[PDB]
Scaffold this active site. Sequence first.
Site, PDB file in Angstrom:
ATOM      1  N   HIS B  44       0.798  -1.212   0.000  1.00  0.00           N
ATOM      2  CA  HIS B  44       0.000   0.000   0.000  1.00  0.00           C
ATOM      3  C   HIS B  44       0.842   1.279   0.000  1.00  0.00           C
ATOM      4  O   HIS B  44       0.353   2.354  -0.335  1.00  0.00           O
ATOM      5  CB  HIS B  44      -0.997   0.004   1.176  1.00  0.00           C
ATOM      6  N   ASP B  91      -0.525  -7.359   1.728  1.00  0.00           N
ATOM      7  CA  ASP B  91       0.097  -6.035   1.784  1.00  0.00           C
ATOM      8  C   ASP B  91       1.596  -6.181   1.904  1.00  0.00           C
ATOM      9  O   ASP B  91       2.154  -6.053   3.002  1.00  0.00           O
ATOM     10  CB  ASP B  91      -0.419  -5.228   2.977  1.00  0.00           C
ATOM     11  N   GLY B 192       2.763   6.426   9.300  1.00  0.00           N
ATOM     12  CA  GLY B 192       4.151   6.607   8.909  1.00  0.00           C
ATOM     13  C   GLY B 192       5.059   5.425   9.262  1.00  0.00           C
ATOM     14  O   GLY B 192       6.213   5.361   8.798  1.00  0.00           O
ATOM     15  N   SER B 194       4.159   2.352   8.577  1.00  0.00           N
ATOM     16  CA  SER B 194       3.829   1.482   7.435  1.00  0.00           C
ATOM     17  C   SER B 194       5.012   1.008   6.619  1.00  0.00           C
ATOM     18  O   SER B 194       5.876   1.804   6.245  1.00  0.00           O
ATOM     19  CB  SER B 194       2.910   2.225   6.454  1.00  0.00           C
ATOM     20  N   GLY B 195       5.022  -0.287   6.300  1.00  0.00           N
ATOM     21  CA  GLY B 195       6.101  -0.836   5.503  1.00  0.00           C
ATOM     22  C   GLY B 195       7.311  -1.220   6.319  1.00  0.00           C
ATOM     23  O   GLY B 195       8.175  -1.937   5.830  1.00  0.00           O
TER      24      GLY B 195
END
Lengths: 243, 243, 243, 243
Positions: B44, B91, B192, B194-195
């Site tokens: 995402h 994801d 923030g 994320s990933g």
Amino acid sequence: IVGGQEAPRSKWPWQVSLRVRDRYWMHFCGGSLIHPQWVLTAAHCLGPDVKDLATLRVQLREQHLYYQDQLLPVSRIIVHPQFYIIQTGADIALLELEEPVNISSRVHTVMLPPASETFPPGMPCWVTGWGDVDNDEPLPPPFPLKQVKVPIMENHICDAKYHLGAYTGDDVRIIRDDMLCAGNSQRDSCKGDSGGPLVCKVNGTWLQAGVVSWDEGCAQPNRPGIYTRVTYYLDWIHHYVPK
Amino acid sequence: IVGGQEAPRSKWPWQVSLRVRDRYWMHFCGGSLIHPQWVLTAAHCLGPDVKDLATLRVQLREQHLYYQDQLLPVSRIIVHPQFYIIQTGADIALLELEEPVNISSRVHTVMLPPASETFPPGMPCWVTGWGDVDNDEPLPPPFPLKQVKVPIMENHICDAKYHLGAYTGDDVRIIRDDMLCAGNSQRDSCKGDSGGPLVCKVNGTWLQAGVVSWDEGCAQPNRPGIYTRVTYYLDWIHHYVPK
Amino acid sequence: IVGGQEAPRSKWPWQVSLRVRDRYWMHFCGGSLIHPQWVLTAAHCLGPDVKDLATLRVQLREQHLYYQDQLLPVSRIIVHPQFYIIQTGADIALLELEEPVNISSRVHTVMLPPASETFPPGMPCWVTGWGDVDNDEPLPPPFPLKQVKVPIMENHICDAKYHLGAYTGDDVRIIRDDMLCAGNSQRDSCKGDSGGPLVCKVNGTWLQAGVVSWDEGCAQPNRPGIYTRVTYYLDWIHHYVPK
Amino acid sequence: IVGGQEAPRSKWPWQVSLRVRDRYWMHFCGGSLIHPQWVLTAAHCLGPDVKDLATLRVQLREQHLYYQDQLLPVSRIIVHPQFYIIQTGADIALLELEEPVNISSRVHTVMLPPASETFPPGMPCWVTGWGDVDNDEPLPPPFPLKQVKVPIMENHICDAKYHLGAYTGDDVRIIRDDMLCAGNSQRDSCKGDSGGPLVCKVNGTWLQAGVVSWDEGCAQPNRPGIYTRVTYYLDWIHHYVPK
């Protein structure tokens, strides 16, 4: 509504505005009067956390939002149990008015459609609401109800478009059978039209083909607006609403 | 990172920062070095639309974001084909660096877990990143890399939590098998993160159990942070990543 | 207007709304019809820089802003030359309508006071407008004209109040002779009432005591709203508006 | 700073950043070290409401804001008593540090000018700070101290320019004698530089000519940045600062 025009006073007598309590009774979604004591809107509009009926209210057809208000209390809120997020469908919900409303030439239900009715391209269909007139462009006061004719397309065609310029594999379905797509790069629903109606005139009769579900593209190429297909949910709707 | 602390300069040498060019090379997601030339992050973060390589740079471990930038170009972006939205899993994504990075003590790879590893509750795990420190509270400058220990729970236990206070029927599953939940009302990932990585020490070694996928909770009770269960995608990762 | 009430359709028939064209003819300041063809307002509303006449419209007495607009073009804009900033007085201006207006009991002028007239304390006065209802609390739709009775006070009392909690020297005047203060911690003018009228009923006749000049206090303790003393500028006004 | 560049580390050893306690110790104004225990800044920076010394710290010259903070407490703040609003001048203040600072080649005082120096056009002057790099464009991380050479102009010519495009009468003085103007349409101070120094090299020595006072123009034509003219306040300064 993007690319449309102010609606004539006589049109869409079934259009309603859902109000939540803040500094004032603010519009947060649209919806339709499908029955004297029932309103059809979108699930995403009511969720995610279960709400307190004391905070919600329904306003009937009004040329200009907030002007001649007359809020109506709601006795019951029913959100489809399959609903979890717009992209996985089942984005539909029902609001039981506290008491029937006086139906007249200016205010009445819209006819739901026949289960057999798919709505092929070419069918004249319109979306209506008080949504933004463009990406981050609120409907300016006095907030006239707007409408716009949008072309309807077939799901598999819409699904193809959604995969254009996207990483998602062609074999993974984005557009589901309980969804219906409409709109182009110039005409579409937009932020705040959610819950409202997509109506098509079939054999001289207006039928509600969909409930505005994804209204954030605001006429974005290859990402037409997505609507919950009413035909797919008649059985659920008739499990609570009469006639 | 909500409720954590600044990380010791020696910890997490695999943490990376993904940058997009705006007025400056701004941080928009975290990532982890899983091979000298490969970064693991969330799908995402790169989506929705296919992104042009030239707008993205990778930044290796920095104690403070933006202070000593040595931005690296990316030669390949591989987003999992099953990915469409956060709530439907898959994801995950990979970034192939235009060049391999010089492995040292300050910066090296984190190890992926054995397909059999399930990371059961009580396991010692940490989430790291430069995300917000609370809802609508960005990480203040000088942007120290933060860390916070989180309680990893079991999927059905998380699934149950997500149904609390929701119209969604206990019938329909929210937490999929390729997802992993961790964090509570005090410790969690936030906008923030994320990933970035969720790592746990297993028998004396740090193993990457998850990838931050849903970080918008920021310690919201009964809506713990959701991660992408790395074990579930080892096959897919190894098709691209050697060693 | 803070702590006031919606105004009766029959009160304040001289109230006007100044509009500047943007996405719609948006209200930026109030004003008062003081002659069939002249509107009295605040200079700071038209400055700082000279404005293109075409960018300005005048809306006469209206119960709800935007709902029944009949925008009128202006032929002349005359900002008192002595005006630089609010805090140094002379915050007063005149708009000569492009054409005279028909007078009714619903829309007619307000009479200016006699040069000698003084509005000592205890005197009952009202301030009306469409400004915020509170700090950062815009007047909500349908934007009804609001009103509130405010206590006029003595300048020296006002001047001393403004020195409370400030570094400014007691010996340096903050409130000038061409100023007049009114309002308290509960009732006051607020952002958007600027340019509008402060009227006091005297000897059975409504007379405009001032022009809202400084309206950002919004009922702040020891910082009562400041108005331009109409009496002080009678000569200037009369040099432009006959009778 | 607008139209400027990063400052070499060896330049402007007297620059200071004033910090206010919020989510972190945030820069709200610049200042200069004019004596081992005293900082010169703008009054508007310290008001209007009297501030609590506990929420204030001074940060000495730093190449990148926030990256190597060593905050210093303030024992006393002295706002010029004549100060009310920027536009009427006297925009100047002093901060006494709790302890003197150790002066090094990297950190040391700037010299005040002789009462007779007028700084005429052509003098090579520079303004420094961490303010915005353009209208509504914050200095991006890692926040380098910036500098820009600005042409100094005569007070009367500056005053003439400020009346162009304004309603304000030419007979009303805008630029007072305790003010000084510098900058053009490409080079200027911008929001956040307030309080910082305007220094000119005279006879091989840097002299602080001004204190940034009005910095919102950000290189607006005919609206150059206005500074508090230091020579005009030498006596007030020397009443508190030794040496």
